[PDB]
Design a binder for this molecule. Structure first.
Ligand SMILES: [Mg+2]
Ligand SMILES: [Mg+2]
Ligand SMILES: [Mg+2]
Ligand SMILES: [Mg+2]
Ligand SMILES: [Mg+2]
Ligand SMILES: [Mg+2]
Ligand SMILES: [Mg+2]
Ligand SMILES: [Mg+2]
Ligand SMILES: [Mg+2]
Ligand SMILES: [Mg+2]
Ligand SMILES: [Mg+2]
Ligand SMILES: [Mg+2]
Ligand SMILES: [Mg+2]
Ligand SMILES: [Mg+2]
Ligand SMILES: [Mg+2]
Ligand SMILES: [Mg+2]
Ligand SMILES: [Zn+2]
Lengths: 66, 99, 90, 98, 101, 83, 239
RNA sequence: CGCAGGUCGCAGUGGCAAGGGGGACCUGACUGUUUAACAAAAACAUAGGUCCCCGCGAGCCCGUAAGGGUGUGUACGGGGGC
RNA sequence: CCGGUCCUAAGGCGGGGCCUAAUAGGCACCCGCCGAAAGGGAAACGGGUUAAUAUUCCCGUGCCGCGGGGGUAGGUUCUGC
């Protein structure tokens, strides 16, 4: 598993994921892009997570809550 | 004459064993072996490291050379040294032979 | 500074037109600051952490890295909580 | 000529550069008048000074002692592998050239 | 002085070690500017520490702060162009720890 | 594999698991780093810890790279320029 | 059963053999060295009696020689007839001036060196007889012999001299030395055995033996073996 | 780690744990080794001393032989006695 | 992905050759191979499960070697910065 801090970098893997897992906390949200090779995690502010989640759904990437 | 003993010196590690004569031959050799010598190359008064019997190393200039078993230069070895190292004497003789 | 090797590589990669590498070096810069500062806070070396956070705030301004600001705010919040507990215990 | 007494005069009246690293820099960048090298200098150092002094057109005098003895002849408590005379103030240390 | 404008040198350290170049400018007592033309020898134009270049007995006549084509025209005047393309080859098997203490 | 763990060839590493057990992991020791062919000292740029063979190590950007130190290379080039 | 210790040694059992795998290689001249070389290492070799020098020739040939006293790492040596008689140089014997101390002396050219190889030893070049390609040398024992003038020797004395002047203070110290050598350590006196195990073994007051002739068979040929004389009187007659 | 004070027992290193000491002679210098199953020693070994055979195509030893050990060695060495 | 398996050690075996009345006896030589489940040495961890196996099954998260497809840097007289 790998951690990415930049949203722009993470989206390259997020757009190609088999599934994106969402784990919510009070101050941040973990988004985990499950690719065939690696699980890519990014921590984002909750407002950013909603925007990112909407874009992934619009690109027909599966999003699940864990 | 030694750090804590009068005569035994380095052979003090043997205690009262092996006989006075044996421990005396050891002390006579080891006082020179573990004392300070002059590097044949840089001429510094340094405690040379004996890597093995006959092999000596200078910690200042790195000179690694063949010597005696327990002293860096034997009596007969001193007279047949390599002359790339007797450069001080070649220049000293010439200076006396010029001015 | 601790993460100056990454600052130079970003300039070098950008000056050569390597946009992909500049992004990767940008990621490594954030990793260097956040990972090191987080470890200092966890070990309660708050003074070492604060110098990293200060430098982190400057390079975030220099390179316009929003995610760096978000993570610095999180770590500063944890620092104040640690300091609060110390003063009360004192 | 007493080399030591005249060297101490050159040091205190003129300009003398002491040490292999600074002597090399003077040969490469400055214009020294004489370079003195100890007789027991290492092969790498002697060849370096010999090469640079040749390209610089500066004579070399090989001191008839060790680097420890050259330091004593300069009234210094340390070794001197090589030194460069840039200014013979009131001595005739340049008499060693010929 | 040996390391002067026009003196051909061989860099001894760095990525460009072993490549010939030419001193074109003098910055201070530690640094000179060398540009053994990049298209010719592979050394780009920048400052260099005088301890990281070994002088050569070959010297050319050029002006202070000379440019790359002025250097190029002078090398062919002295006929050293093919000399400035050969890279110096070390003989590592003749080095012993005494030389690099 | 049990007498193989009685020898000191492998590191004995004690670790606690997420299940609450403390176990011993038997791990390999680091391989020695590349050394200078002349002085035998570790070469700069390549003395990172490596625990298995078959891992490509990048040599420094210099002629003769990870074979001799910079000191050996510079001296050898100085000798050749004169000679 | 009844074969005595000297007879069992010849079978070459492990306890009688030399552990020569502990050493890097034989210390001998290769047959075709010439030119200049460099001393690249000076090493202790287990079981040997002197330090060993590793020499690299210009053509990349490496060989082991016993280190001359004063030899140093990085020294340039010369091999061949053109080589000056300086310490560490390898010269044909017919070219070495008289009165020169040499070591590792070949008896015939190409045998690799036979005489004066132990630490502190040397051979003296006594004379030259070039009309039949022979050099006269004095060996460490004092014996004067003739050698092939084309054979090679090294200039100087063998390093590591004085080793035997320091006592082996303990049994354990000689024990560790013996393990790098071929010696069986320790030794039992013949008179400490029973008769089946030695000619000297036996009686209520055990005694040594009178000398045996040179024709004595193995198993009988122990003690003094065809000795010219014994005791202090023999040393006096030797002189 | 120390100081001042108070105090109990027959007993305070309270159990546990934990040298009796000194004088002299003979003998082997010492540590070490030994009769697996009646002997542990003053026996063997030992460092040190000394003598002998030997310049290496040697000396000594093994093998029917081919050959081998010492020897990847070389008198500051190998072997053999005391 | 745990060990063997691979490597060589002290050493050993076989073919050739030499020796032998002869061999299933000897081996200095040439060639090959064997020789370590404590040496060297590719890569897996945690949790769960069974009456009885568990780094082997199941879940999750990986690694190594070999091979291939796409993208990219790079290359396309000549050289990466
Ligand atoms: Mg193993
Ligand atoms: Mg290991
Ligand atoms: Mg043995
Ligand atoms: Mg008996
Ligand atoms: Mg009998
Ligand atoms: Mg008889
Ligand atoms: Mg009898
Ligand atoms: Mg008790
Ligand atoms: Mg006893
Ligand atoms: Mg018994
Ligand atoms: Mg008993
Ligand atoms: Mg006895
Ligand atoms: Mg006695
Ligand atoms: Mg007698
Ligand atoms: Mg095998
Ligand atoms: Mg079970
Ligand atoms: Zn020195």
């Amino acid at each position: 598993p790998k951690e990415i801090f930049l949203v722009e970098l993470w989206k390259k893997y997020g757009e190609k994921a088999q599934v994106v897992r969402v784990k919510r906390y009070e101050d941040f949200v973990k988004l985990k892009a499950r690719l065939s090779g690696y699980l890519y995690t990014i921590r984002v502010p909750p407002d950013k997570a909603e925007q990112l989640i909407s874009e992934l759904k619009a690109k027909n990437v599966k999003v699940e809550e864990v | 004459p030694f750090s804590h003993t009068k005569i035994v010196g380095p052979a003090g590690r043997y205690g009262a064993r092996y006989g006075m004569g044996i421990r005396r031959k050891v002390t006579t050799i080891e006082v020179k072996q573990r004392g300070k010598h002059r590097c044949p190359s840089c001429r510094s008064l340094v405690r040379l490291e004996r890597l093995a019997f006959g092999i000596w190393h200078c910690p200042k200039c790195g000179h690694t050379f063949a010597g005696g078993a327990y002293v860096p230069q034997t009596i007969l070895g001193k007279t047949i040294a390599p002359e790339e190292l007797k450069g001080v004497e070649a220049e000293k003789a010439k200076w006396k032979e010029a001015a | 500074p601790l993460c100056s090797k990454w600052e130079s590589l970003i300039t070098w990669a950008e000056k050569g037109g390597n946009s992909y590498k500049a992004l990767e070096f940008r990621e490594k810069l954030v990793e260097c600051i956040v990972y090191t500062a987080t470890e200092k806070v966890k070990k309660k070396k708050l003074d070492e952490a604060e110098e990293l956070l200060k430098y982190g705030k400057e390079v975030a301004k220099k390179f316009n890295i929003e995610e760096l600001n978000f993570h610095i705010a999180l770590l500063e919040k944890e620092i104040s909580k640690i300091r609060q507990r110390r003063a009360q215990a004192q | 000529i007493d080399i030591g007494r005249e060297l101490q005069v050159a040091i205190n009246t003129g300009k003398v550069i002491i040490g292999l690293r600074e002597t090399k820099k003077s040969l490469l960048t400055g214009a020294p008048k004489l370079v003195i090298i100890a007789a027991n200098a290492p092969r790498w150092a002697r060849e370096d000074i010999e090469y640079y002094a040749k390209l610089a057109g500066v004579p070399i005098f090989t001191f008839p002692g060790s680097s420890i003895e050259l330091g004593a002849a300069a009234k210094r408590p340390h070794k001197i592998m090589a030194l460069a005379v840039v200014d013979p103030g009131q001595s005739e240390i340049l008499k060693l050239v010929e | 002085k040996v390391i002067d404008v026009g003196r051909v040198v061989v860099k001894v350290l760095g990525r460009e070690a072993g490549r010939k170049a030419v001193v074109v400018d003098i910055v201070d007592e530690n640094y000179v500017v060398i540009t053994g033309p990049k298209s010719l020898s592979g050394v780009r134009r920048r400052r260099v520490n005088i301890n990281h270049i070994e002088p050569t007995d070959k010297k050319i006549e050029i002006k202070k702060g000379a440019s790359d084509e002025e250097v190029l025209k002078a090398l062919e005047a002295a006929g050293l162009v093919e000399y400035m393309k050969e890279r110096v080859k070390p003989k590592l098997f003749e080095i012993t720890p005494a030389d690099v203490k | 594999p049990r007498p193989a763990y009685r020898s000191r060839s492998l590191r004995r590493v004690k670790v606690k698991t997420p299940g609450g057990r403390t176990v011993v992991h038997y791990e390999k020791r680091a391989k020695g780093v590349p050394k200078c062919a002349v002085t035998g000292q570790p070469l700069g740029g390549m003395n990172s810890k490596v625990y298995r063979f078959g891992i490509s190590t990048r040599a420094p950007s210099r002629p003769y790279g990870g074979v001799v130190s910079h000191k050996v290379l510079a001296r050898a080039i100085r000798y050749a320029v004169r000679r | 059963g009844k074969r005595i210790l000297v007879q069992r040694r010849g079978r070459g059992g492990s306890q009688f053999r030399s552990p020569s795998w502990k050493r890097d290689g034989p210390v001998r001249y290769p047959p075709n060295i010439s030119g200049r070389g460099i001393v690249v290492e000076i090493l202790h070799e287990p079981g040997l009696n002197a330090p060993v020098a590793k020499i690299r020739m210009e053509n990349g040939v490496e060989f082991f020689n016993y280190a001359a006293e004063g030899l140093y790492v990085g020294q340039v040596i010369q091999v061949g007839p053109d080589a000056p008689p300086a310490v560490g140089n390898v010269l044909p014997l017919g070219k070495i001036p008289e009165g020169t101390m040499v070591f590792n002396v070949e008896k015939r050219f190409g045998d690799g060196g036979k005489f004066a190889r132990s630490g502190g030893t040397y051979a003296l070049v006594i004379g030259q007889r070039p009309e039949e390609n022979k050099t006269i040398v004095r060996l460490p024992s004092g014996r004067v012999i003739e050698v092939d003038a084309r054979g090679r020797a090294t200039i100087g004395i063998v390093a590591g001299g004085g080793r035997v002047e320091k006592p082996f203070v303990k049994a354990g110290k000689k024990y560790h030395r013996a393990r790098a050598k071929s010696w069986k350590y320790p030794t039992v006196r013949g008179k400490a055995m029973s008769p089946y195990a030695h000619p000297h073994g036996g009686g209520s007051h055990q005694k040594g033996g009178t000398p045996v002739p040179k024709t004595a068979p193995p198993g009988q040929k122990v003690g003094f073996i065809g000795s010219r004389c014994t005791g202090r009187g023999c040393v006096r007659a030797r002189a």
